[PDB]
Design a protein around this ligand. Structure first.
Ligand SMILES: *c1ccc(C(=O)NCc2ccccc2)cc1C(=O)Nc1ccccc1
Lengths: 12, 259
């Protein structure tokens, strides 16, 4: 959940 | 007979592309880390945290030390995930995957890559921190009260074995790309496109290790065997993350703003 947030932001 | 043919030349070009991107994404490289650890650099000598008094002084050069140290670990892992994601964007084909598959790959891969690359910054004595500005001893970390005392120790156990393979940044750039494009991660939508990129990266890795390691004929196989060590490390790591959430208190600022 927290990990996925950071990943999605960083890919954008 | 290995030949320097168009196919091999392209695999060397793919290896260089990843190496260059690796250098751009990752502030402290294994080449520089090993220079620091062996005292063969002109850069500033790291401050050594080896006891409670050297921790206090080091926090210059939470009421609870073990918690403060875990807090710094947590913030560093957010930073590392950002660096690995930037790297992942440079791997040919990766950003062209379904965005859900890109996310799945990184969510299941980042911990394996974090402990692979943390080994570059580790020796029998300890680990470089603050991009090589500090050195925290393995035994000082082991001295932290349960459950923090046993948090990093399995990553040291992995790293002294891993470091014995004497991989360099050129080897590691491809190895990490292979980890990211693992078609066996749970919940992947479209597996074959991932397998196809992994297959090309496995060819590039195998050729890298043949050219770069004339004295270990089966280093490629030895490296693929290290993925079971990494999976176990991450399985055990995730169990410890939970116990710490259940039994302790402590978010990174980026995470607070995302909500
Ligand atoms: C230190 C403490 C916690 C974690 C970790 O896996 N936390 C879970 C998490 C949740 C959301 C986003 C990121 C992470 C990792 C560490 C750790 O290994 N830190 C580290 C990483 C690289 C180099 C040095 C230290």
């Amino acid at each position: 959940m927290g990990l996925e947030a950071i990943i999605r932001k960083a890919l954008m | 007979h290995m030949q320097l043919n168009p196919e091999s030349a392209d695999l060397r070009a793919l290896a260089k592309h990843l190496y260059d991107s690796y250098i751009k994404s990752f502030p402290l490289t294994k080449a520089k880390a090993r220079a620091i650890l062996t005292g063969k650099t002109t850069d500033k000598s790291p401050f050594v945290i080896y006891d409670m008094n050297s921790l206090m002084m080091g926090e210059d050069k939470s009421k609870e030390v073990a918690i403060r140290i875990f807090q710094g670990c947590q913030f560093r892992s957010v930073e590392a995930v950002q660096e690995i994601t930037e790297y992942a964007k440079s791997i040919p084909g990766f950003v062209n995957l379904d965005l859900n598959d890109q996310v799945t790959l990184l969510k299941y891969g980042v911990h394996e890559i974090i402990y692979t690359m943390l080994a570059s910054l580790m020796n029998k004595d300890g680990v470089l921190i603050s991009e090589g500005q500090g050195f925290m001893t393995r035994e000082f970390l082991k001295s932290l009260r349960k459950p923090f005392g046993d948090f990093m120790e399995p990553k040291f156990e992995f790293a002294v074995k891993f470091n014995a393979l004497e991989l360099d940044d050129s080897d590691l750039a491809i190895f990490i790309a292979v980890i990211i494009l693992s078609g066996d991660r749970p919940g992947l939508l479209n597996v074959k496109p991932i397998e196809d990129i992994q297959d090309n990266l496995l060819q590039a890795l195998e050729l890298q290790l043949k050219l770069n390691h004339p004295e270990s004929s089966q280093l490629f196989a030895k490296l693929l065997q290290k993925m079971t060590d990494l999976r176990q490390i991450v399985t055990e790591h995730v169990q410890l993350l939970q116990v710490i959430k259940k039994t302790e208190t402590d978010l990174h600022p980026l995470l607070q703003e995302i909500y």
